[PDB]
Design a protein around this motif. Structure first.
Motif, mmCIF file in Angstrom:
data_model
loop_
_atom_site.group_PDB
_atom_site.id
_atom_site.type_symbol
_atom_site.label_atom_id
_atom_site.label_comp_id
_atom_site.label_asym_id
_atom_site.label_seq_id
_atom_site.Cartn_x
_atom_site.Cartn_y
_atom_site.Cartn_z
ATOM 1 N N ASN A 52 37.023 2.372 10.663
ATOM 2 C CA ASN A 52 36.818 1.889 9.267
ATOM 3 C C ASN A 52 37.654 2.712 8.282
ATOM 4 O OD1 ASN A 52 33.409 0.601 9.690
ATOM 5 N ND2 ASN A 52 35.400 -0.261 10.239
ATOM 6 N N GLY A 53 38.672 3.430 8.769
ATOM 7 C CA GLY A 53 39.570 4.158 7.849
ATOM 8 C C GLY A 53 39.906 5.564 8.308
ATOM 9 N N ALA A 54 41.123 6.032 8.008
ATOM 10 C CA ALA A 54 41.545 7.406 8.361
ATOM 11 C C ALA A 54 41.220 8.325 7.181
ATOM 12 C CB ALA A 54 43.020 7.411 8.667
ATOM 13 N N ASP A 55 40.539 9.445 7.424
ATOM 14 C CA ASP A 55 40.096 10.301 6.295
ATOM 15 C C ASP A 55 41.250 10.989 5.548
ATOM 16 O OD1 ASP A 55 37.281 9.556 6.037
ATOM 17 O OD2 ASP A 55 37.111 10.386 8.066
ATOM 18 N N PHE A 56 42.271 11.515 6.232
ATOM 19 C CA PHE A 56 43.344 12.262 5.522
ATOM 20 C C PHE A 56 44.705 11.768 5.992
ATOM 21 C CE2 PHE A 56 40.093 15.335 7.036
ATOM 22 C CZ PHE A 56 39.566 15.816 5.861
ATOM 23 N N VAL A 57 45.665 11.607 5.084
ATOM 24 C CA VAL A 57 46.988 11.044 5.475
ATOM 25 C C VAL A 57 48.106 11.678 4.661
ATOM 26 C CG1 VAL A 57 47.257 9.063 3.909
ATOM 27 C CG2 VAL A 57 48.069 8.882 6.251
ATOM 28 N N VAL A 58 49.271 11.868 5.269
ATOM 29 C CA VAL A 58 50.472 12.337 4.528
ATOM 30 C C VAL A 58 51.634 11.502 5.076
ATOM 31 C CG1 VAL A 58 52.140 14.250 4.410
ATOM 32 C CG2 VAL A 58 49.750 14.668 3.822
ATOM 33 N N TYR A 59 52.356 10.797 4.208
ATOM 34 C CA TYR A 59 53.471 9.939 4.666
ATOM 35 C C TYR A 59 54.774 10.532 4.154
ATOM 36 C CZ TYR A 59 50.159 5.897 5.010
ATOM 37 O OH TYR A 59 49.124 5.057 5.305
ATOM 38 N N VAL A 60 55.722 10.800 5.040
ATOM 39 C CA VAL A 60 57.047 11.253 4.550
ATOM 40 C C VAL A 60 58.088 10.264 5.071
ATOM 41 C CG1 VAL A 60 58.544 13.266 4.238
ATOM 42 C CG2 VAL A 60 56.143 13.605 4.815
ATOM 43 N N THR A 93 61.791 7.787 3.626
ATOM 44 C CA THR A 93 62.671 7.347 2.525
ATOM 45 C C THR A 93 62.629 5.819 2.433
ATOM 46 O OG1 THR A 93 64.247 7.639 4.257
ATOM 47 C CG2 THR A 93 64.352 9.232 2.470
ATOM 48 N N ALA A 94 61.501 5.219 2.034
ATOM 49 C CA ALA A 94 61.398 3.739 2.044
ATOM 50 C C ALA A 94 60.641 3.226 0.825
ATOM 51 C CB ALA A 94 60.742 3.273 3.307
ATOM 52 N N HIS A 95 60.979 2.020 0.345
ATOM 53 C CA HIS A 95 60.374 1.470 -0.903
ATOM 54 C C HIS A 95 59.727 0.107 -0.638
ATOM 55 C CE1 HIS A 95 62.402 4.779 -2.971
ATOM 56 N NE2 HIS A 95 63.513 4.432 -2.315
ATOM 57 N N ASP A 96 58.764 -0.314 -1.459
ATOM 58 C CA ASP A 96 57.972 -1.547 -1.172
ATOM 59 C C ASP A 96 58.652 -2.866 -1.564
ATOM 60 O OD1 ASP A 96 57.636 -1.281 -3.922
ATOM 61 O OD2 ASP A 96 55.466 -1.602 -3.892
ATOM 62 N N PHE A 97 59.836 -2.851 -2.178
ATOM 63 C CA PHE A 97 60.469 -4.097 -2.696
ATOM 64 C C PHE A 97 60.743 -5.112 -1.578
ATOM 65 C CE2 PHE A 97 65.255 -3.450 -2.302
ATOM 66 C CZ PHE A 97 65.212 -2.269 -1.601
ATOM 67 N N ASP A 98 61.130 -4.648 -0.393
ATOM 68 C CA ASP A 98 61.517 -5.542 0.730
ATOM 69 C C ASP A 98 60.301 -6.216 1.380
ATOM 70 O OD1 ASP A 98 60.834 -3.065 1.780
ATOM 71 O OD2 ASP A 98 62.855 -2.609 2.492
ATOM 72 N N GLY A 99 59.094 -5.790 1.046
ATOM 73 C CA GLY A 99 57.899 -6.368 1.680
ATOM 74 C C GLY A 99 57.689 -5.804 3.070
ATOM 75 N N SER A 100 58.503 -4.824 3.483
ATOM 76 C CA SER A 100 58.430 -4.241 4.849
ATOM 77 C C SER A 100 57.162 -3.404 5.035
ATOM 78 C CB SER A 100 59.654 -3.438 5.155
ATOM 79 O OG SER A 100 59.774 -2.340 4.268
ATOM 80 N N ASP A 101 56.708 -3.250 6.283
ATOM 81 C CA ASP A 101 55.505 -2.428 6.581
ATOM 82 C C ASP A 101 55.857 -0.963 6.326
ATOM 83 O OD1 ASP A 101 53.107 -1.261 8.002
ATOM 84 O OD2 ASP A 101 54.577 -0.966 9.615
ATOM 85 N N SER A 102 57.064 -0.543 6.718
ATOM 86 C CA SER A 102 57.452 0.879 6.561
ATOM 87 C C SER A 102 57.491 1.240 5.080
ATOM 88 C CB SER A 102 58.815 1.084 7.143
ATOM 89 O OG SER A 102 58.882 0.583 8.465
ATOM 90 N N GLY A 103 58.133 0.408 4.262
ATOM 91 C CA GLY A 103 58.329 0.717 2.838
ATOM 92 C C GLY A 103 57.026 0.709 2.093
ATOM 93 N N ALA A 104 56.012 0.072 2.659
ATOM 94 C CA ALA A 104 54.744 -0.065 1.926
ATOM 95 C C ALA A 104 54.257 1.312 1.502
ATOM 96 C CB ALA A 104 53.727 -0.717 2.814
ATOM 97 N N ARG A 105 53.812 1.424 0.262
ATOM 98 C CA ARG A 105 53.230 2.688 -0.225
ATOM 99 C C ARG A 105 51.804 2.737 0.334
ATOM 100 N NH1 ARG A 105 51.723 1.846 -4.605
ATOM 101 N NH2 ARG A 105 51.883 -0.412 -4.911
ATOM 102 N N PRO A 106 51.022 3.829 0.183
ATOM 103 C CA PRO A 106 49.691 3.914 0.781
ATOM 104 C C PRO A 106 48.782 2.755 0.369
ATOM 105 C CG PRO A 106 50.291 6.047 -0.115
ATOM 106 C CD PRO A 106 51.399 5.084 -0.481
ATOM 107 N N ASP A 107 48.929 2.216 -0.847
ATOM 108 C CA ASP A 107 48.020 1.140 -1.342
ATOM 109 C C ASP A 107 48.075 -0.123 -0.466
ATOM 110 O OD1 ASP A 107 46.572 2.549 -3.153
ATOM 111 O OD2 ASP A 107 47.215 1.400 -4.920
#
Ligand SMILES: NC(=O)c1ccc[n+]([C@@H]2O[C@H](COP(=O)([O-])OP(=O)(O)OC[C@H]3O[C@@H](n4cnc5c(N)ncnc54)[C@H](O)[C@@H]3O)[C@@H](O)[C@H]2O)c1
Ligand SMILES: NC(=O)c1ccc[n+]([C@@H]2O[C@H](COP(=O)([O-])OP(=O)(O)OC[C@H]3O[C@@H](n4cnc5c(N)ncnc54)[C@H](O)[C@@H]3O)[C@@H](O)[C@H]2O)c1
Ligand SMILES: NC(=O)c1ccc[n+]([C@@H]2O[C@H](COP(=O)([O-])OP(=O)(O)OC[C@H]3O[C@@H](n4cnc5c(N)ncnc54)[C@H](O)[C@@H]3O)[C@@H](O)[C@H]2O)c1
Ligand SMILES: NC(=O)c1ccc[n+]([C@@H]2O[C@H](COP(=O)([O-])OP(=O)(O)OC[C@H]3O[C@@H](n4cnc5c(N)ncnc54)[C@H](O)[C@@H]3O)[C@@H](O)[C@H]2O)c1
Lengths: 136, 333, 333, 334, 328
Positions: free
Chosen positions: E265-273, E275-289
């Motif tokens: 039901n969810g991961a308690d702690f996360v850190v994403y590093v 170089t990707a942005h959400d404009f392309d609709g890609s899974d990688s570029g997706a921000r945490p939201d």
């Protein structure tokens, strides 16, 4: 400036100006809260721009529209009969280019030997005044 | 109860309807939703009117059609758009006086005049920098070194007459005034700047010294000293440009000083009514160029009433459709 | 053909932060660039050859360093609002940086921070909401409304005095000269500009009007007309600045007007010698901000001999290690 | 020669003319015109020395098919099938202009879900907590609802039970591609890209099929009915064998990821793809495969040295409509 | 609202600069906040399930955590000099599980046989027999060394399957390979010796999968079953109280760990590093939201993303958080 509605009068740079523009800014990077007021000089028909703060007031100039009977064209000052019945020769015809000037003379002439008199209008701001309309 | 994603299926026969693709770009999703919404914002600007100032009246040149508008349109163009084939879609916008004011970076001002003087060559992004220097070819799209020298021969006389006029007739030159006079001097229908001179469109570049024009001003001052350009008068003119209109719209393509000058000027107006941003920059670095439309609403450059649209794409792809789906329809209409 | 070897941490629990930096050049990708960048900044400081620089103003209680190196720092407005201001203030206090080149917003922020400090935030807040609460946004950093009124009150008397000198003593004001006077006026050790004014470090912003200072110049012009700022004299001073040096070194943190102004100026000596660009931008758009050092070599802005290093990262992450690996060693040395 | 199309003074704009000059507009537009060129070469590659023809099709009556000597592979990332570009893809599969498709688990699941229920549009900046609170899932500015994924579960669970039964009784060995060929044949909606690939015998390969909605279903079925085996070993032999016979190979990768690698690794067997068009939004500075330029792929021998690779740095939602309009539509009419 | 004050250099202490990073703005604010999230994971104890017990190897320090940590590394990371920082995490059993693509799995084993090396024309690199990833080039000879080592283990795995009926999967093969390398240098060897599971559902997508293809035409009947592996990878996060994800990069590695955390039901702690942005609709570029929208990240949890290359951020991240734990 809190009562400065458009269509009212103000003295900008010394020329009686009718408010025809005003913008107000709450605040911002531009600086503290400011307001741009704009108005056209009655004599030259020229709009001018000023920028000021709030909690202040600007000079207002007493201008009164005034009709007088045209009695004679005294070679540029004109004999003018006041409603009081006193005679003022202070007012001069409108300047060149101002088509009023031709409309005052052409209408004095149509009327001179006739029983109709010309009524002029001389809007008066303190000493300043100019025939701005005429009519049979 | 919101809209359904749906692309237009291509024709089985094989005659593709480009008109039907343009209509269905909004419902494709991702950046296509943006292109469709960008067309919509410009259409609102061209077809705006109210019952009481008229803009787009033009300079009444014969053989040209103009249609009056109640909306004032400010176009922010970076040098790239006046260096790419997007010039043909901007000259058309200026010729028909569909844009009231333009703000451009100095290389863009220098490019139009050099383009009317000489053509641009094609090239690659991955070209060796050291080799291109040996061949004296600049890179942006290759604009040759010889091209700037032909431009130098043209600009130097207008400034010398400007110096003579400033001392003799008390003419206080500013950056905008030099460009309007320079545009009148080109006398080539190809120029976006000539059309703005003929149709009374003011062009403002705050850093006009940063560019080829600034180097030519520098060399002239040593030969003929005392030329003065006053930014104080230019900032007085530019800031007052938005105040007059019933509504103003900003089509900022690219980012930089041009994005900021048009947005800063709209603060005096309490905010721009309509806006379209097309650029390839992201807000993570904290930069102004990548700042999203939301950051511009933060400092009051964008009206809270506006529905700003940003297309995250290279302008060379987005604008040709943008002219096709908005300006071309209204002028011919 | 060296190996890719990273630092291995100590088993006990002690981690030498120095030892992590020693292996950056050998860790691959952008670490390779950050380590290679530290080398170029080190080369600038230790390039003394048989032309006096970094002498400073001789202020007591301040350490000073040797000559044979002109350093031009291309900072953008975003960095000065950030906490990188502390690193810049240290760099100019010791006069390693011979010249300041920055946009109008950085010039305004340094002074407002003296009057009042910056606040944090995040990238995700309704821009409409921020403005309702009278708060400007710059990335995730909020510069409050009051900070702009304090700047206006401080600069307004100085501008009136500047006009009086032009009216009475005939002083021809230009954009760099106004900043130097404001640096002396603040008389505050915290300001980067104050140290530059004390150490005779010229500040050159070409488009000063594009910011709060220019907006402030406009509102003064109505009350007190006739203030004139010339770009002709400024371009002569800014362009000639690279010419008088043993070698010229650029640290362009950011991109845009500041990148072109320092590089275009370095075209005068046929190309700068040492350069470190830290910007989040790429060449696909053809923009000046995203250009590789290689495109700059094509113009002639970077020397052919020069090894240009560009770290494709955010300066806010690269800079703290960059001073640590180069300038701090020199001051103690 | 840098050039542009002036919209006419009488407002006459030929969209065809806008597309025709794109190649000469400069920057990214040059890449879009160049991209249309290589894709057209793939359709017109038919040549003369039996002879091997691709695009023969299912032979279904009432549908136009055209024979081609060049074999075309299409790499589709999962977002594209969620996007309206699905309609442009359905056109290539229906007329069998694409021989093989490599698509990740998410894209395969979406085409079958799209038939079951439709995906909704939206904005990138929407609260992630709120979207989950409303029981909505997000893929960019699109919102596939929670109920829709349940519909895929109802349809897939019976087919999987039949797959286990065949393995136990008829000794059928099931690999990921075989599972999708059965799933495509059974969709029964002419809307599906996969239905046409099943009808025209087009092999669809997903290496990480469990990495998606299909994988949670496969996992959930295992506990109720244990024994299903999906062998990557058979799939690797089939997928690598695909490129061999073709006279020429047409690689169209839209997006990047495992799909760019899967097709690109396969092309090493015949020494490299002969025609490649990549449209993506990634940069090589991080050393990643996804952002790798065509040149990095040329390094390991995935692209033929002879081939002129084209990369358009743009969201595919804006570049593919012009690529289909300027290439396949005209060829089918021809 | 906290102020923005950078560390004032003394008229240098690298440790003091790291304390003020959270206050220097932009991506530095995130690198400072990221170090904090990693610190929180290590120093979380809840009395009732200990993890990071280790393999019991003599001379190696190990510490109990009520926290399970999932580290998702794209292949490029193992390829670079970040391998040493990742090895340190597994040696002290700080990371409970690892998900990595066939390139990282192949890379650790290949480096042990032959080392990795540091704009280059792509055509020229093929002519010199060189494979290029970023500025790191792996020689073509290195792949042959992996071939010799893997083939005998594959023959033995088929023999065990034929007689002892062991059903193989991708995770089991990697553990068997770690037992064969027997090198503390290997990230996988310390994972295996410490009983740390490594998952790779597209294991055929890489050199290991290409090696399987050549083996089948000589010794047929080897079966790598994905069905069993998905059950193990999805079941990894369910038992604990807390789970921590440090995803360096995006893609299958990001989706596999996140999807598994949906089961708890969810991961308690996360850190994403990345170089990707959400404009392309890609899974990688997706921000945490976007990841929060599926339900992969706990609504209560605060996610962190550093828009930066891992090569710059991680050396500071290990220095700012884990090194303190071993020192403690
Ligand atoms: N070709 C040139 O860019 C050029 C030419 C001569 C001089 N200059 C000088 O460079 C300085 C800065 O130039 P600027 O203010 O125009 O900014 P810029 O050219 O550096 O562009 C800044 C940002 O605008 C966007 N952008 C620019 N061109 C784009 C395109 N074609 N498609 C999509 N996005 C695009 C990108 O987000 C980019 O990061 C000015 O002083 C200018 O005079 C630039
Ligand atoms: N704080 C502000 O941004 C600010 C404030 C007032 C006025 N202005 C005006 O904005 C105009 C241009 O803005 P600008 O000077 O900030 O430049 P900019 O925003 O155009 O920056 C250009 C490029 O520099 C790089 N860059 C910027 N910030 C970076 C960072 N923190 N780390 C790494 N790379 C970075 C990126 O490539 C960016 O696209 C100028 O005329 C200036 O006077 C800006
Ligand atoms: N919608 C989804 O992406 C989705 C849905 C469910 C499952 N998954 C799973 O996620 C894993 C990774 O997904 P992936 O391999 O498809 O990669 P991805 O979707 O994360 O995309 C990777 C890269 O492809 C490029 N790209 C993606 N979309 C693009 C677009 N529209 N235009 C241009 N470039 C684009 C970019 O370089 C991006 O960084 C797979 O195992 C997949 O099954 C993803
Ligand atoms: N080293 C390699 O690139 C390599 C080697 C062999 C095989 N492969 C295969 O390639 C396929 C795709 O690779 P993937 O899914 O591991 O990743 P990917 O190439 O899809 O990476 C996706 C995104 O992650 C980010 N990213 C990757 N590495 C990063 C880093 N070091 N720092 C910051 N951000 C980073 C980038 O935004 C990138 O676009 C896998 O199936 C893999 O087996 C890759």
């Amino acid at each position: 400036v809190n009562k400065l509605k458009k269509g009212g009068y103000v003295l900008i740079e010394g020329r009686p100006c009718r408010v025809v523009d005003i913008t107000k800014s709450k605040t911002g990077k531009h600086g503290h809260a400011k307001a741009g007021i704009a108005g056209t000089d009655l004599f030259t028909g020229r709009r001018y721009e000023t920028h000021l703060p709030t909690s202040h007031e600007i000079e207002v100039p007493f201008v009164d529209r005034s009709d007088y009977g045209l009695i004679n064209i005294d070679d540029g000052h004109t004999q003018l009969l006041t409603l009081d019945g006193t005679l003022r020769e202070d007012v001069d015809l409108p300047p060149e280019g101002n088509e009023m000037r031709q409309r005052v003379i052409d209408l004095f002439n149509v009327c001179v030997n006739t029983n109709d008199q010309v009524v002029v209008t001389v809007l008066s701001s303190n000493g300043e005044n100019l025939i701005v309309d005429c009519k049979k | 109860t919101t809209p359904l994603v749906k692309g237009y299926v291509p024709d089985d026969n094989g005659k593709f309807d480009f008109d039907k693709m343009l209509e269905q770009m909004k419902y494709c999703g991702f950046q296509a939703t943006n292109l469709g919404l960008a067309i919509d914002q410009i259409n609102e600007m061209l077809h705006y009117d109210y019952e009481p100032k008229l803009f787009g009246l033009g300079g009444g040149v014969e053989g040209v059609k103009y249609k009056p508008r109640a909306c004032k349109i400010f176009l922010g163009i970076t040098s790239n758009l006046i260096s790419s084939g997007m010039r043909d879609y901007i000259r058309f916008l200026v010729k028909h006086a569909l844009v009231d004011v333009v703000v451009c970076t100095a290389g863009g001002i220098e490019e139009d005049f050099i383009k009317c003087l000489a053509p641009t060559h094609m090239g690659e992004f991955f070209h060796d920098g050291h080799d291109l220097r040996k061949r004296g070819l600049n890179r942006i799209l290759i604009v040759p070194n010889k091209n700037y020298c032909l431009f130098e021969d043209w600009i130097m006389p207008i400034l010398d007459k400007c110096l003579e006029e400033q001392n003799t007739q008390g003419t206080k030159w500013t950056p905008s005034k030099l460009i309007h006079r320079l545009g009148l001097e080109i006398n080539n229908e190809d120029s976006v700047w000539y059309w703005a001179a003929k149709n009374n469109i003011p062009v403002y570049s705050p850093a006009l010294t940063d560019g080829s024009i600034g180097d030519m001003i520098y060399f002239h001052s040593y030969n003929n000293p005392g030329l003065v350009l006053d930014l104080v008068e230019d900032i007085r003119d530019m800031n007052n440009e938005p105040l007059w209109a019933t509504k103003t719209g900003c089509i900022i393509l690219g980012g930089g000083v041009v994005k900021h000058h048009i947005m800063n000027a709209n603060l005096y107006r309490n905010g721009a009514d309509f806006v379209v941003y097309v650029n390839t920059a992201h807000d993570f670095d904290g930069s102004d160029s990548g700042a999203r439309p939301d950051e511009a609403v933060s400092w009051g450059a964008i009206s809270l009433e506006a529905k700003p649209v940003k297309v995250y794409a290279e302008v060379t792809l987005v604008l040709p459709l943008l002219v096709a789906g908005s300006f071309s329809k209204f002028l011919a209409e």
